[PDB]
Design an enzyme around this catalytic site. Structure first.
Site, PDB file in Angstrom:
ATOM      1  N   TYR A  54       6.258   1.572   2.031  1.00 23.19           N
ATOM      2  CA  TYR A  54       4.827   1.720   1.796  1.00 23.19           C
ATOM      3  C   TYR A  54       4.075   1.134   2.968  1.00 23.19           C
ATOM      4  O   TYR A  54       4.392   0.047   3.437  1.00 23.19           O
ATOM      5  CB  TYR A  54       4.440   0.982   0.513  1.00 23.19           C
ATOM      6  CG  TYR A  54       2.958   0.850   0.207  1.00 23.19           C
ATOM      7  CD1 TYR A  54       2.105   1.942   0.261  1.00 23.19           C
ATOM      8  CD2 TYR A  54       2.437  -0.367  -0.193  1.00 23.19           C
ATOM      9  CE1 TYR A  54       0.744   1.813  -0.061  1.00 23.19           C
ATOM     10  CE2 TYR A  54       1.089  -0.509  -0.515  1.00 23.19           C
ATOM     11  CZ  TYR A  54       0.254   0.584  -0.451  1.00 23.19           C
ATOM     12  OH  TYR A  54      -1.083   0.437  -0.782  1.00 23.19           O
ATOM     13  N   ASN A  56      -0.163   0.875   4.264  1.00 21.48           N
ATOM     14  CA  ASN A  56      -1.543   1.164   4.627  1.00 21.48           C
ATOM     15  C   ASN A  56      -1.547   1.091   6.133  1.00 21.48           C
ATOM     16  O   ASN A  56      -1.293   0.032   6.697  1.00 21.48           O
ATOM     17  CB  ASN A  56      -2.483   0.105   4.052  1.00 21.48           C
ATOM     18  CG  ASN A  56      -2.614   0.196   2.550  1.00 21.48           C
ATOM     19  OD1 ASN A  56      -2.276  -0.748   1.817  1.00 21.48           O
ATOM     20  ND2 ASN A  56      -3.084   1.332   2.076  1.00 21.48           N
ATOM     21  N   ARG A 100      -8.350  12.010  -0.450  1.00 23.40           N
ATOM     22  CA  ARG A 100      -8.957  11.316  -1.582  1.00 23.40           C
ATOM     23  C   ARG A 100     -10.064  10.374  -1.169  1.00 23.40           C
ATOM     24  O   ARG A 100     -10.247  10.072   0.015  1.00 23.40           O
ATOM     25  CB  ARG A 100      -7.921  10.459  -2.333  1.00 23.40           C
ATOM     26  CG  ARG A 100      -6.463  10.783  -2.100  1.00 23.40           C
ATOM     27  CD  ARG A 100      -5.601   9.880  -2.991  1.00 23.40           C
ATOM     28  NE  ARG A 100      -5.612   8.447  -2.664  1.00 23.40           N
ATOM     29  CZ  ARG A 100      -4.714   7.846  -1.878  1.00 23.40           C
ATOM     30  NH1 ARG A 100      -3.739   8.550  -1.315  1.00 23.40           N
ATOM     31  NH2 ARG A 100      -4.775   6.543  -1.658  1.00 23.40           N
ATOM     32  N   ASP A 102     -10.852   6.485  -2.696  1.00 22.19           N
ATOM     33  CA  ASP A 102     -10.488   5.415  -3.615  1.00 22.19           C
ATOM     34  C   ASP A 102     -11.644   4.426  -3.636  1.00 22.19           C
ATOM     35  O   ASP A 102     -12.091   3.985  -2.578  1.00 22.19           O
ATOM     36  CB  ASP A 102      -9.260   4.650  -3.121  1.00 22.19           C
ATOM     37  CG  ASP A 102      -7.977   5.465  -3.122  1.00 22.19           C
ATOM     38  OD1 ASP A 102      -7.971   6.669  -3.438  1.00 22.19           O
ATOM     39  OD2 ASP A 102      -6.942   4.853  -2.762  1.00 22.19           O
ATOM     40  N   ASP A 133      -0.824   5.594   3.644  1.00 17.36           N
ATOM     41  CA  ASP A 133      -2.243   5.918   3.538  1.00 17.36           C
ATOM     42  C   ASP A 133      -2.941   5.622   4.861  1.00 17.36           C
ATOM     43  O   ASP A 133      -2.807   4.528   5.436  1.00 17.36           O
ATOM     44  CB  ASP A 133      -2.915   5.085   2.435  1.00 17.36           C
ATOM     45  CG  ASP A 133      -2.809   5.707   1.053  1.00 17.36           C
ATOM     46  OD1 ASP A 133      -2.472   6.909   0.929  1.00 17.36           O
ATOM     47  OD2 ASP A 133      -3.105   4.969   0.078  1.00 17.36           O
TER      48      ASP A 133
END
Lengths: 149, 145
Positions: A54, A56, A100, A102, A133
């Protein structure tokens, strides 16, 4: 806490199925997006393979399911994800993409910001093996008045 | 440009499989021309462009102006697309763009995820998502206004 509805950007697709999940993997990813507002790392980690990562992108990556869970738990100590709206979702070659907004709220300050994010997910056997992301971190930090980097 | 640890090992992931994907990869190749007048030919009249940390440009004329402004300050020296995919008229590209700031001569490898909307083989929208502060700090140029 009240969160205002995320509006549709000018550029949102004229193709009405652009936001629709059309494969089992896209459906998993939209369910995962729904789950983000739980602010619950233990709930979220169930979506991940053991061999996973993961990131960011403005911050360092986490490799492995334990590290990903720890990173998420750390994030939810500081931030609440109050809403997620996925305008566009698509996929090819084992990767799913989501465009998206958020809504993120910094618990230490009470301030919120609608983050424009484009994300990519890698899935194997219906489990997330990678999630990255992409967004601008400085805009978030300035808006919520909390340095993150 | 090094291959990221997380990049697919299957080279099909970075290869175009549709006509729109082919156009987007051709466009990525064209970026190193640093030529807004050349690049604008890929765009529909009804279009938009945004580097997400900066203001959007709406309409083909504004897109060309924004591109021209960008190329007075930066050169794009290389673009490597690790992953490309598409659904519903949108193409997604996970890339590294090597950018060089003309005033300082310094270069930086920018991690970018981008989305392209296409109608009839022409670009109706292009949005690139990345962290601007990292670029500014690496090339010694305070880009944002």
């Amino acid at each position: 806490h009240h969160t205002s509805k995320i509006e549709q950007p000018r550029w949102a697709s004229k193709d009405s199925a652009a936001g629709a999940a059309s494969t089992p993997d896209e459906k998993i990813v939209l369910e995962f997006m729904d789950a983000l507002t739980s602010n619950d790392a233990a709930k979220l980690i169930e979506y991940f393979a053991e061999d996973t990562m993961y990131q960011n992108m403005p911050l360092p990556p986490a490799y492995g399911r334990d590290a990903v869970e720890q990173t998420l738990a750390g994030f939810f100590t500081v931030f609440s994800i109050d809403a997620v709206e996925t305008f566009h979702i698509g996929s090819s070659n084992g990767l799913v993409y989501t465009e998206r907004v958020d809504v993120v709220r910094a618990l230490p300050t009470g301030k919120s910001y609608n983050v424009s994010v484009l994300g990519v997910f890698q899935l194997t056997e219906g489990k997330i093996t990678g999630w990255r992301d992409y967004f601008d971190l400085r805009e978030v930090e300035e808006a919520v008045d909390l340095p993150v980097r």
